[PDB]
Design a protein around this ligand. Structure first.
Ligand SMILES: [Cl-]
Ligand SMILES: [Cl-]
Lengths: 6, 137, 134, 6
């Protein structure tokens, strides 16, 4: 759910 | 055109090198990354985008671009989505025994490539600053 | 002067960030590194030196500068040896929740820092070095 | 004995 991951 | 970079990958010693070329100047940024994945590509792009005014990257459009992560970095950073791999490899092979680790030889090769003066010739490093400076003012 | 950089370290979340500041412009390059060692410091410097025309780096002269490897890289690269952590940390804390990994937040912060505008730091450093080229 | 190590 983050920019780099998920 | 001062904002346009080309990103490719190249391989040596079983490792992945990303090479960003500033098309107008021939300046490069390159680094060994641990794997040719969206995440590592997006990290490398986000780094580049913080250092130069990157408007458009042209990539090979392969596997590491079909996912979320590069697109997320490029959106955030406002980036729109070789002989050079061969040249860089040539320089890397000239400095390779000076360094234990490939990554060090890569950064020596980037240094060489960017500071080499092909004559009152300019280096790639001087070319990129002059092209972007001209664009700014 | 256009070739002068200052290299400092800063710490967040148990990790080491090297921050290189181009003194005339305020432009930064910063990265998380695995450990504050000579080798990782020399790598970071060799990278910086290939990207900008680095003539002198002012460091804190601490433990990662007493050995061989930074001096070998500065020799090779032709670099002589001899506020910002706070601002970067501020930016980092503003973007931190956007990224899982600290390193990503650091580079977002560098991007913000260097592009924030009536010139940004990124514009300043290229104008200072272009003016130097003659 | 190399730039980065030894
Ligand atoms: Cl790629
Ligand atoms: Cl340090």
């Amino acid at each position: 759910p983050k920019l780099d991951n998920x | 055109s001062p904002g346009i970079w080309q990103l490719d990958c190249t391989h040596l010693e079983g490792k992945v090198i990303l090479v960003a070329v500033h098309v107008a100047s021939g300046y490069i940024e390159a680094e060994v990354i641990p794997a040719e994945t969206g995440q590592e590509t997006a990290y490398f792009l986000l780094k580049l985008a913080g250092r130069w005014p990157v408007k458009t990257v042209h990539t090979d459009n392969g596997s590491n671009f079909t996912g979320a992560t590069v697109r997320a970095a490029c959106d955030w950073a406002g980036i729109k989505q070789e002989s050079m791999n061969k040249e860089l490899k040539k320089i890397i092979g000239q400095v390779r025994d000076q360094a234990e680790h490939l990554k060090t030889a890569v950064q020596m090769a980037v240094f060489i490539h960017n500071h080499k003066r092909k004559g009152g010739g300019y280096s790639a490093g001087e070319r990129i600053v002059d092209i972007i400076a001209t664009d700014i003012q």
